Amino acid sequence: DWTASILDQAQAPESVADFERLLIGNPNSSVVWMNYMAFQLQLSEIEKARELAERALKTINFREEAEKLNIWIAMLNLENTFGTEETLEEVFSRACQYMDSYTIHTKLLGIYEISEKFDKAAELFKATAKKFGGEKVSIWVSWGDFLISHNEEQEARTILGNALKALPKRNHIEVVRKFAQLEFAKGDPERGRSLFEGLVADAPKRIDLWNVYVDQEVKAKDKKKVEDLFERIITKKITRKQAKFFFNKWLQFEESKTIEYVKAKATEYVAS
Amino acid sequence: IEDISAMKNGFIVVPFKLPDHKALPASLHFMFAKRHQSSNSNESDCLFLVNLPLLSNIEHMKKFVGQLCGKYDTVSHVEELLYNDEFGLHEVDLSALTSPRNTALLKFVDAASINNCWNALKKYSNLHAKHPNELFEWTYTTPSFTTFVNFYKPLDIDYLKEDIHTHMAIFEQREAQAQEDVQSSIVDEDGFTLVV
Amino acid sequence: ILTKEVQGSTLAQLTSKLIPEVINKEIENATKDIFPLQNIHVRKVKLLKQPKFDVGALMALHG
Amino acid sequence: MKLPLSVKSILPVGSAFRYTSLCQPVPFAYSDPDFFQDVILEFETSPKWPDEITSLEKAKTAFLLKIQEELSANSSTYRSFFSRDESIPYNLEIVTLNILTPEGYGFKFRVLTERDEILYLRAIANARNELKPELEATFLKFTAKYLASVRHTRTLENISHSYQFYSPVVRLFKRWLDTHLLLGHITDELAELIAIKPFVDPAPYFIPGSLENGFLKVLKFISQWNWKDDPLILDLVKPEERLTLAQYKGIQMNFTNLRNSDPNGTHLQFFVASKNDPSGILYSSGIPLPIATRLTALAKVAVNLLQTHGLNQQTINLLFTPGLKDYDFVVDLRTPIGLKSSCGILSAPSNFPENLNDLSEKMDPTYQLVKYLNLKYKNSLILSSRKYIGVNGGEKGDKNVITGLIKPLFKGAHKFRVNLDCNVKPVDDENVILNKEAIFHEIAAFGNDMVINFETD
């Protein structure tokens, strides 16, 4: 129960001597450790579970990088729902010093969302965008998922001007596409259409921008906005085999009266 | 068991028939492969290998890839067997600090070797299900008495002295060109780490 | 320097340290950072508090 | 001899200098592994020692080249050559000076400087938090090899005059560890300090005035002692420099601080501490737990065996007989050259040959065999053998045995990771279990001609 949620964020023994023999049999498996941590948490032995987290940092093998990365996710889960802010500021500091610090921020934001501490979360979204925003794309995307889910689309509209100021020019294509996929999935699809239109007017030769913008509209299922945008593709320059994949998406969508009109166009373009 | 062709995380299963012995009463060895993705220049066209066989050198891998090219009729050349720390001898760098186990990087000469040989591993991975008698037997190099008593043999005096003079003859001159002020800056930074 | 030399492996090694005056050079190795020196010797040693006879260990120097 | 750096010390730290060598020193019997005695070598304190460990050990090497140049220049009765020392992890540049006298004995010379500990503790300070306990093992073997062995051979050679019966008891006890295949994992000085407690603390019994009483007090004390709950603290002095109360309680604080982090004693089993070793872990780390519980268990089988069937000849025969039980596999070995005569054991070696490469013709292939088998299968297997094949290898002294135990880490299915260090077979596309028989083909093909019989579980 508690261990799978730690394994959710990362991407029968019934006594004390039960786990301690399995720690001999498995000193490098956090499934053995965290169940023995959850054995203490369900018995309300939080203080005993704090020292077991300290033992696991010195017992598990040192080449096990993602395995030791699981433990700091478990440690931040301890003093958030059982400890205080002064206990949380000590572990989170030492977690950033020892492992990759940016990955620690990505897990600790995920804990605040599940534990529903949104006032402490958006303060931490703001600080990490200050120091990791000029290099990392996903730190704006995780804050892009946060603002839309709490109905702050106008705050999720000013996210791009701060992202285009911070990210370099080679990441300007990436941050617009990732924000606008959240619009067709979680926000307003018309707001997403105002974002891809900047990429069409800036990069017409980049052909996979046309595919993503018609990937999000098939999931939108609007019958008029599909037939408009697929007709705007073919007037641009597409090669021989790539244009057939556009016919592969355009034939099967109308199947799931107007099917003879789209079969009459798929064969006129081979001769001319 | 026989239908296992590739791992969940992309490691191709590579079986091996194993040689018989006098004291022993058909077993297989399983070395697992993956394409290696790296921005490093000397780490290009490598196959990341887990669970290598015993005493696997560049020669037995040239033999085995020669068997793969002989079977599926393709072209591939082996360049260099990288990171073969079989006993744990080159795991920890001591000299840089005084100043991944059972894995390897199978370096090839070009990308056609890793594409053709990668597809040859795609076809070789299904032979556990298809034809258990068409697998390739791993012939271990077998150390006799002489190979184990080589470590009791003395050091050669002349090549050791050549290692001394050619070793110091480079570093003493280069470090002699990079003398005091730079090292005082570096150990000044070391004292900067000493204070805080 | 006197104390690090002594209280380990007595006169069988200690007098054997005294004969090629290695200890006097060890003094010179440390004194050089202050003011160098000349001839330095120890010039004298004396015994006052031998515990017991110990003939058996005394026969270790004997062949 | 005249050198650019004057020799500070030539300090012998050999077992034959502390009279614990399992074979008594026979002239020209070089086939014994206790033939070459290690000697610490110290030069004058000079800033001619570099700040990098490879160039440091190569400077020691070139100094030994000057020593070999003078020695072959003017003392050609003494023979000499060079060898590597790789028992210290990741320092492959250690070169020992092997010298053969016309008295038929051989020494290896090693060099210790003051720049050493600065570079090793410097390397510990330079290391990130990942690689630290392995450098604690390298520095621990380094301290066990160069630093405290001078005080060890000094102290045991000192108080050895007070316990004359100590030497055949400790040599016979090391032979008892040789017969039960426990000598390969346990260091010799640790077995000395375990073997010294009925002498340095005879109470409530007396000081053992016989081999029989001493060895039986050793086996009784091992069969009664619990390493988990109880420490072992030694007073290594002569009978009427002893430990005070605050130091004794400080060592007990080290034992309790060790049991705070290792309560079941998996990482550290034997705590044998004294004034020479206040840490108590210098010669007792890196040993597996079934070596400890198997040693205590065989102590209980032996002592309860003598409680049951009394003391006659057949019981003492069963004290030294390997039961070979509770192992995952058994490998029967035989070298084609028997070395019991060339180890200097009566049931004669008279000269060294003209070629030094022929000395390897009278060596132990099984020691390098089980050595590299422990080096490769360190994570997956526990491998025990007889180190002294000329003592316990039959009537010619030419047979060995590799008892192999699968660790409890690799008994079932596991998640496949790149750093697993195991010879596996998949049960699905996600989990793998250990492949026993492929390991068995690697052992048999690794020991192509000498593996005669192979028993499985």
Short mmCIF file of N, CA and C in Angstrom, two decimals, chain A residues 20-21 24-28 55 59 61-65 67 70 97-98, chain D residues 128-131 134 260-261 263-264 266 289 379 408-410 414 417 419:
data_model
loop_
_atom_site.label_atom_id
_atom_site.label_comp_id
_atom_site.label_asym_id
_atom_site.label_seq_id
_atom_site.Cartn_x
_atom_site.Cartn_y
_atom_site.Cartn_z
N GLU A 20 14.25 -9.13 9.15
CA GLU A 20 15.69 -9.11 9.39
C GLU A 20 16.40 -10.29 8.74
N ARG A 21 15.71 -11.43 8.58
CA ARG A 21 16.30 -12.51 7.81
C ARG A 21 16.24 -12.20 6.32
N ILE A 24 19.06 -10.04 5.36
CA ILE A 24 20.24 -10.85 5.07
C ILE A 24 20.12 -11.45 3.67
N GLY A 25 18.93 -11.95 3.33
CA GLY A 25 18.72 -12.51 2.01
C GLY A 25 18.64 -11.46 0.91
N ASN A 26 18.23 -10.24 1.25
CA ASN A 26 18.13 -9.15 0.28
C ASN A 26 18.52 -7.83 0.95
N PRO A 27 19.82 -7.52 0.99
CA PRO A 27 20.23 -6.21 1.51
C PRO A 27 20.09 -5.08 0.50
N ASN A 28 19.74 -5.38 -0.75
CA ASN A 28 19.73 -4.39 -1.81
C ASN A 28 18.36 -4.22 -2.46
N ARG A 55 19.76 3.52 8.23
CA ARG A 55 20.52 2.29 8.07
C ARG A 55 20.56 1.85 6.61
N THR A 59 23.60 0.51 4.03
CA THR A 59 23.59 -0.95 3.90
C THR A 59 23.48 -1.39 2.44
N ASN A 61 23.87 -1.61 -1.56
CA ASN A 61 25.08 -1.53 -2.38
C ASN A 61 25.15 -0.20 -3.13
N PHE A 62 26.38 0.23 -3.41
CA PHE A 62 26.62 1.60 -3.86
C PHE A 62 26.49 1.76 -5.37
N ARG A 63 26.55 0.66 -6.13
CA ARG A 63 26.32 0.76 -7.57
C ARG A 63 24.84 0.80 -7.91
N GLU A 64 23.97 0.62 -6.92
CA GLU A 64 22.53 0.60 -7.11
C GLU A 64 21.96 2.02 -7.03
N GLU A 65 22.02 2.72 -8.17
CA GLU A 65 21.75 4.16 -8.18
C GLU A 65 20.26 4.45 -8.04
N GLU A 67 18.02 2.37 -7.13
CA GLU A 67 17.59 1.72 -5.89
C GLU A 67 17.77 2.64 -4.69
N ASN A 70 15.27 5.41 -4.68
CA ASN A 70 13.96 5.08 -4.14
C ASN A 70 13.86 5.43 -2.66
N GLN A 97 22.01 17.17 -1.87
CA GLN A 97 23.47 17.17 -1.83
C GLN A 97 24.06 15.87 -2.34
N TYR A 98 23.39 14.75 -2.11
CA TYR A 98 23.98 13.43 -2.33
C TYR A 98 23.68 12.85 -3.70
N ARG D 128 33.67 10.53 -3.21
CA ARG D 128 32.28 10.82 -2.92
C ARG D 128 31.71 9.72 -2.02
N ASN D 129 30.46 9.92 -1.60
CA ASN D 129 29.86 9.05 -0.59
C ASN D 129 29.54 7.66 -1.13
N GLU D 130 29.61 7.49 -2.45
CA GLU D 130 29.39 6.19 -3.06
C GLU D 130 30.54 5.23 -2.78
N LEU D 131 31.78 5.64 -3.07
CA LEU D 131 32.90 4.71 -3.12
C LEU D 131 33.65 4.55 -1.80
N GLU D 134 34.72 0.82 0.19
CA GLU D 134 35.72 0.05 -0.54
C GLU D 134 37.12 0.61 -0.30
N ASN D 260 25.28 -1.11 17.14
CA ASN D 260 24.16 -0.22 16.84
C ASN D 260 23.83 -0.24 15.35
N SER D 261 24.85 -0.25 14.50
CA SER D 261 24.67 -0.24 13.06
C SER D 261 24.64 -1.64 12.46
N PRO D 263 23.51 -4.89 14.08
CA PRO D 263 23.02 -5.62 15.25
C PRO D 263 23.07 -7.13 15.10
N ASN D 264 22.90 -7.67 13.89
CA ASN D 264 23.01 -9.10 13.66
C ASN D 264 24.42 -9.53 13.29
N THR D 266 26.17 -9.10 10.53
CA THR D 266 26.37 -9.60 9.17
C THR D 266 27.60 -8.97 8.53
N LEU D 289 29.59 -14.46 6.89
CA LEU D 289 28.90 -14.97 8.07
C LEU D 289 28.86 -16.50 8.20
N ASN D 379 30.58 -11.72 -5.48
CA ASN D 379 29.21 -11.32 -5.18
C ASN D 379 28.27 -12.52 -5.15
N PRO D 408 22.78 -16.59 0.26
CA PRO D 408 21.32 -16.40 0.32
C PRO D 408 20.81 -15.23 -0.51
N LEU D 409 21.70 -14.38 -1.03
CA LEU D 409 21.30 -13.31 -1.93
C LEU D 409 20.77 -13.83 -3.26
N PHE D 410 21.28 -14.96 -3.74
CA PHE D 410 20.93 -15.45 -5.07
C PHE D 410 20.27 -16.83 -5.03
N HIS D 414 14.92 -12.67 -9.16
CA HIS D 414 15.21 -11.27 -8.86
C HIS D 414 14.91 -10.41 -10.07
N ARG D 417 19.00 -6.36 -13.23
CA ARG D 417 19.68 -5.08 -13.31
C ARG D 417 21.06 -5.31 -13.89
N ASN D 419 23.99 -4.34 -12.88
CA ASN D 419 25.03 -4.57 -11.89
C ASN D 419 24.71 -5.75 -10.98
#
